[PDB]
A paper describes a structure:
Viral attachment is a primary determinant of host cell tropism and is initiated by a haemagglutinin-neuraminidase (HN) glycoprotein, haemagglutinin (H) glycoprotein or attachment (G) glycoprotein, depending on the virus. Although MojV-G displays a six-bladed β-propeller fold characteristic to paramyxoviral attachment glycoproteins, our analyses also show that MojV-G is antigenically, structurally and functionally distinct from all other characterized paramyxoviruses.
Following deglycosylation with endoglycosidase F1 (EndoF1), MojV-G was crystallized and the structure was determined to 1.94 Å resolution. MojV-G exhibits a six-bladed β-propeller fold, characteristic of Paramyxovirinae attachment glycoproteins, with each blade of the propeller composed of four antiparallel β-strands. Two nearly identical molecules of MojV-G were observed in the asymmetric unit (0.33 Å root-mean-square (RMS) deviation over 412 aligned Cα atoms), although crystallographic contacts were not consistent with the formation of higher-order MojV-G oligomers, such as those observed in HeV-G18 or other paramyxoviruses. Unlike other paramyxovirus attachment glycoproteins, which are glycosylated throughout the β-propeller18192021222324353637383940414243444546, the ectodomain of MojV-G encodes only four N-linked glycosylation sequons, all of which are located outside the β-propeller domain. Indeed, we observe that paramyxoviral receptor-interacting surfaces exhibit some of the greatest levels of structural deviation with respect to MojV-G. For example, the top face of the MojV-G β-propeller lacks the distinctive ephrin binding pocket observed in NiV-G and other HNVs, and exhibits very low sequence conservation with other HNVs at this region.
Numbering used by the authors: 175 to 184, 193 to 605
The structure:
């Protein structure tokens, strides 16, 4: 009862973030072990419960061994503070984390879901890295033992053969008897393609040089037969206890290099965020009425532009294609049915640290931003979910970062409201 799904609001009507950025302590637990990095959270809010997952890795945040994947089912509640607060209900770990490629969460009605892709295992039980051996799906519910669903070849179909599969850490959604997630990985290709290659004014050579770079940017180490692609995953047949997963791939002509994504419910339609993994660092966000590649329309707005965690050297203005890697994540949350209004967090490099802001983008392109997290040395990611709380739109933002320069990376939660105004 304390929160509800967002109700989009009904002279210039503008929206802006609230003045303050309140802490949401202990949304999930954390050890002080300086040799552990907490990274790649997934955060989903349903009707009242939330779902949260985090990878705990040894030493290295990017390639370090996954020591644990920790899951929290909780509730967003009022504890008499200035903003909404979190109450964990279940703290649980994914079995056999060394076999996991990645997992993400989806919050439902008094229950939550964890979808994980796994790699193959040797006879020793050790993982064979870079591979794919189907999925595990877990259903978490208070006062109910976790239900596990092993989903191997007989129970999934992908429109292309994937040698590796990673669930998009942004998370998934439940709609009725189905779950929807996003995944990315290595898919096999045998046909020619013309990769998406939208950019600004870029000085060319022969004229097709940038298109060649765009094609090569979606290939795996220069191989035309292994591409890094995105796919929608639909999880069918939940009530039967034998779920079936159907996957549908975005062609390179409709996507940049595959990356971590997120599914959204947007009124009676749906949304998709795709983090930049490559040379195109603008916002990549699609709206679809039925969750299909054919019906996914991309927002024209550019913000946020990913400016950290990239080997690219192109400009924010022209974004010229090149072979480079981007590893950040900064999603948005729609504040209107067409997502022409939305909130997000921006992050800019400041030598080893970052400067950060929370923002609302209005349908006319106006950006209302406020500097945030100035007491943090660096913030490197953001995922945002908003909802109704005490008769207003409130949001919770989950951010990886380092409080002080020498600290190990941790995951932090804050809240803020959305203000509605007329000028
Ligand atoms: Cl080609
Ligand atoms: Cl069913
Ligand atoms: Cl930005």
């Amino acid at each position: 009862t304390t929160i509800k799904p967002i109700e989009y609001p009904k002279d210039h009507f503008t929206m802006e973030p609230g003045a303050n950025f309140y802490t949401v302590p202990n949304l999930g637990p954390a050890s002080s072990n300086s040799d552990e990095c907490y990274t790649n959270p997934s955060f989903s809010i349903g009707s009242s419960i939330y779902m949260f997952s985090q990878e705990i890795r040894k030493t290295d945040c990017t390639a370090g061994e996954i020591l644990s994947i920790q899951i929290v089912l909780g509730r967003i509640v009022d504890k008499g503070q200035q903003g909404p607060q979190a109450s964990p209900l279940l703290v649980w770990a994914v079995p056999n984390p060394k076999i996991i490629n990645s997992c993400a969460v989806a919050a439902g009605d008094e229950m939550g879901w964890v979808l994980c892709s796994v790699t193959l295992t040797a006879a020793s039980g050790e993982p064979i890295p870079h591979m794919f051996d189907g999925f595990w799906l877990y259903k978490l519910e208070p006062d109910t033992e976790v239900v596990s669903y092993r989903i191997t070849g007989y129970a999934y179909l992908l429109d292309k053969q994937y040698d590796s599969v990673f669930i998009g850490k942004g998370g998934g959604i439940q709609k009725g008897n189905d779950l929807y997630f996003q995944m990315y990985g290595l898919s096999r290709n045998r046909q020619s393609f013309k990769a998406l290659c939208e950019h600004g004014s870029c000085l060319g050579t022969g004229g097709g040089g940038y298109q060649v770079l765009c094609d090569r940017a979606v290939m795996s180490f220069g191989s035309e037969e292994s591409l890094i692609t995105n796919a929608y995953l639909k999880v069918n047949d939940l009530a039967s206890g034998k779920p079936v997963i159907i996957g549908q791939t975005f062609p390179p002509s409709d996507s940049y290099k595959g990356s971590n994504g997120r599914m959204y419910t947007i009124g009676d339609k749906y949304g998709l965020y795709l983090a930049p993994s490559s040379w195109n660092r603008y916002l990549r966000f699609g709206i679809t009425p039925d969750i299909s590649v054919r019906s996914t329309t991309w927002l024209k707005s550019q913000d946020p532009i990913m400016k950290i965690l990239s080997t690219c050297t192109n400009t924010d203005r022209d974004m010229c294609p090149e072979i480079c890697n981007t590893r950040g994540y900064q999603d948005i949350f729609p504040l209107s049915e067409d997502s022409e209004y939305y909130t997000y967090i921006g992050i800019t490099p400041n030598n080893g640290g970052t400067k950060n802001f929370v923002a609302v983008r209005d349908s006319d392109g106006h950006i209302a931003s406020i500097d945030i997290l100035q007491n943090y040395y660096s913030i490197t990611s953001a995922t945002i979910s908003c909802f109704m709380y005490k008769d207003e739109i409130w949001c919770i933002a989950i951010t990886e970062g380092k409080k002080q320069k020498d600290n190990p990376q941790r995951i932090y939660a804050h809240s803020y409201k959305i203000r509605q105004m007329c000028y």
